[PDB]
Specification:
The structure is a homodimer. By secondary structure, chain A is α/β, with parallel strands linked by helices. The first copy, chain A, has 2 domains: 284 residues, Aldolase class I (TIM Barrel, Alpha-Beta Barrel), CATH 3.20.20.70; 180 residues, no CATH class. Chain A has 22 helices and 11 strands. β1 of chain A pairs antiparallel with β1 of chain B. The complex binds cobalt (II) ion (2 copies). Chains A, B: This is Methylmalonyl-CoA carboxyltransferase 5S subunit.
Chain lengths: 471, 471
């Protein structure tokens, strides 16, 4: 047999240690003083982009580190002046708990670019191209790199056709590149290869594509090799001393494997070696936050992310009937289908999970949560497939809400001023739109943070004194 | 571009959890009671072979577990009756500290087969086909599967040509299959592919080849994918809950990645799931023996295995001048070349290491160890390349020994009876050739073990009581 592979070329690499790595391995608890020491080396490493913001870091900065995310960004911008900063943004949900009016989005993106962010990976938990439409436009306006995301998953209705169709929409709404986000490491080799190849084949070699695979299942570094053969443009990795497990593949490993393949990743190996040693010395101080598993191929059978899994397990233990776990494992599939097969990521995974528990407890949809009902009624957006009209009807009947199918942000009122007004009454507020955004995104935290921020950022990691006095 | 790949087929898998996995991750300290519970499942998993003996397990059984290796084998043979048992045997060195007369070898192999071993992976630390010649013959005589090994490494004189030449010798001395042993995870993708393809191309598709890659560097699972494309016959893996790090790639991961590639590994996924959960519950009791690194691509620059590295680091600290480490790192290359570029594995790595320290300390070869001199004089066998005649001369001059170049076992006297005689005087001896072999292999331990063996095997792992009282 013959396998057509892409021509010899440089592959781009995106380092994730400053954001997704620690968010995935140590609950986003990584402190800023523990990171800044590797910025210079990271800046000189030779990465295509450096993901250092977005995701749960915004929340973890104000909720657990008494740190100002905007200060973290302004510092990274200053310490890595030659690098393309990158961040994760959940579209019309920004980094918040709900959707927001376009005003908010415009201001957020506006302030993010103004403070130095270069690449914005905009994504949506249900893959609704509409919820990414505005953010994408806000980034293009700001003259920044827009990156439309596709949340990869395995389901009866997800196919290469379906992902190419999605790639066309991301592009049509003016995406400067397409990012394939595989957070559960469900992206197998052949599929990774075909999907990448199909996109490039349909829209053209010029179509820029970035592959973001985690290594929870342990098969994605091979997918990264295939992806590169299909001709992918960039692949995300994490410095070896902060990889594997629910983390990602190792940068040095991924750069080393290419030797002699005709492909190459122009990265300074010595720079990388310094970065590795850096976090290798810091990582033990975060053991109270490490996950205890390195490989888990279970989701290939269950389709249930381990995180989601336990989140229900303990959810059942609280009712002692936590022995029906086996029944729940069988209910999820059925609940997901009812919801139109949405990727199982936050919040779809936690929503679908809980609802699956109620069903295995109080009968099939005899009771639904506010969220589940809102997902069935379409207040989060359109599902990859059609939702069980039966259940949709029931939702509207149980809650009392109106079933909608248009961008959930269309029927949202201007809320900026209102946010500004309320934020200008919290002790500690500084008057910037930044502090306003923090209140609009985290209304429950903004108060306590604004009052303590003057104390300076802290850390919840063990001190070198504690590592000692223990081991 | 086009890449020729092998036709669709089943790939064989060899589980290593019962031997190499725990030897690599927890210093061979795994206890037998902690393992037997997974034997039934492992037997029904569907593996090509199950490595459950050889390596340092023979030593660790008598030196730390007060267990009889032959009893361990007879039990595995009994608990996994449908499986092909496999073991690692360092040729004319068997599992001992020195070479032995052919008698010993014949008796050892004879007793190993008699007790149930089916596949013998015979290998040699310097790749001298002669030191494997007799063992290989002993296995064929015993009607068992002989597996000639090639220790893969990266050096100025190691090439695909060189490995094919070696493959021809292994075959010529009647090898039923060729095993490519990469213990430092130096086997990159393209090389793994070319080497496998070359062998198959030269000697034929029928030539059976088994790939044994560790994952210390983090690039070998990709090599395993390529190897399979080049048409490899079997690949070694370790149950996911006992993988990565200085360990190996995960069995479930490796079996899962093939989906849709036209290749497949007929393994019972549920059986595998039980095996995984088994060792996942047992593995924490061995934390006092776990390695603290998961990925390390340093040997690609240094060519110095991390194990060898630290083994010198601490070797220098004992002299306070442990700051010349940088000079040692530069000396090794030079010492290896002098020795003819031997793979850096036990004992070549520890020998070459020490000698490299003396050089960086007492001047270039101003003093040599007994071993280094014996390696230069050829008492371990022939090197992959020629040894610096300069240094060879110096060796013979420093020690006083005669320089030889023929199989070091040719000039060895019959020693069985002598061993039997001496072993029949140790309290606890049972009179079997087995107990005699133990004395011949471990003369320093056989005494203490024979006196305590009646106490039954023990464990040096934390007790479920200790895990608790700690965490
Ligand atoms: Co991620
Ligand atoms: Co091994």
């Amino acid at each position: 047999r013959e396998i057509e592979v892409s021509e010899p070329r440089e592959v781009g690499i995106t380092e994730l240690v400053l954001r997704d790595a620690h968010q995935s391995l140590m609950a986003t608890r990584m402190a800023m003083e523990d990171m800044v020491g590797a910025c210079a080396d990271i800046d000189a490493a030779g990465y295509w982009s450096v993901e250092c913001w977005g995701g749960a870091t915004y929340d973890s900065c104000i909720r657990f580190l008494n740190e100002d995310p905007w200060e973290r960004l302004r510092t990274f911008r200053k310490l890595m002046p030659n690098s393309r900063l990158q961040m994760l943004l959940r579209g019309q949900n920004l980094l918040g708990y709900r959707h927001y009016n376009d005003e908010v989005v415009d201001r957020f993106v506006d302030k993010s670019a103004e403070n130095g962010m270069d690449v914005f990976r905009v994504f949506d938990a249900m893959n609704d191209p509409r919820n990414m439409a505005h953010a994408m436009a806000a980034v293009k306006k700001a003259g920044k790199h827009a990156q439309g995301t596709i949340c990869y998953t395995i389901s009866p209705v997800h196919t290469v056709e379906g992902y190419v169709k999605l790639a066309g929409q991301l592009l049509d709404m003016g995406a400067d590149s397409i990012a394939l986000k595989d957070i559960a490491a469900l992206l197998k080799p052949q599929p990774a290869y075909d999907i990448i190849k199909a996109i490039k084949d349909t829209y053209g070699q010029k179509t820029q594509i970035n592959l973001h695979c985690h290594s929870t299942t342990g098969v994605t570094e091979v997918s990264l090799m295939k992806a590169i053969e299909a001709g992918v443009d960039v692949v995300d990795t994490a410095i070896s001393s902060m990889s594997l497990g629910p983390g990602h593949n190792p940068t040095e490993s991924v750069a080393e494997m290419l030797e002699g393949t005709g492909y190459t990743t122009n990265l300074d190996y010595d720079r990388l070696h310094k970065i590795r040693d850096h976090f290798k010395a810091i990582r033990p101080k975060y053991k109270k936050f490490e996950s205890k598993t390195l490989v888990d191929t279970s989701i290939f059978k269950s389709q249930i992310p381990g995180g989601m899994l336990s989140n229900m397990e303990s959810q059942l233990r609280a009712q002692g009937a936590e022995d029906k776990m086996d029944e729940v494992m069988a209910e999820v599939p059925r609940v997901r289908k009812a919801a139109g097969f949405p990727p199982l990521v936050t919040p779809s995974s936690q929503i679908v999970g809980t609802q699956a528990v109620f069903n295995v407890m109080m009968g099939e949809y005899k009771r639904m949560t506010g969220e589940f009902a809102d997902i069935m009624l379409g207040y989060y957006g359109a599902s990859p497939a059609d939702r069980d009209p039966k259940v949709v009807k029931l939702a509207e009947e149980q809650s009392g809400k109106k079933p909608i199918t248009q961008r959930p942000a269309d029927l949202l009122p201007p809320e900026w001023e209102k946010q500004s007004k309320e934020a200008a009454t919290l002790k500690g507020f500084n008057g910037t739109d930044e502090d306003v955004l923090t209140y609009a995104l985290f209304p429950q935290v903004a108060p306590v943070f604004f009052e303590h921020r003057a104390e300076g950022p802290h850390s919840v990691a063990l001190t070198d004194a504690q590592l000692k006095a223990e081991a």
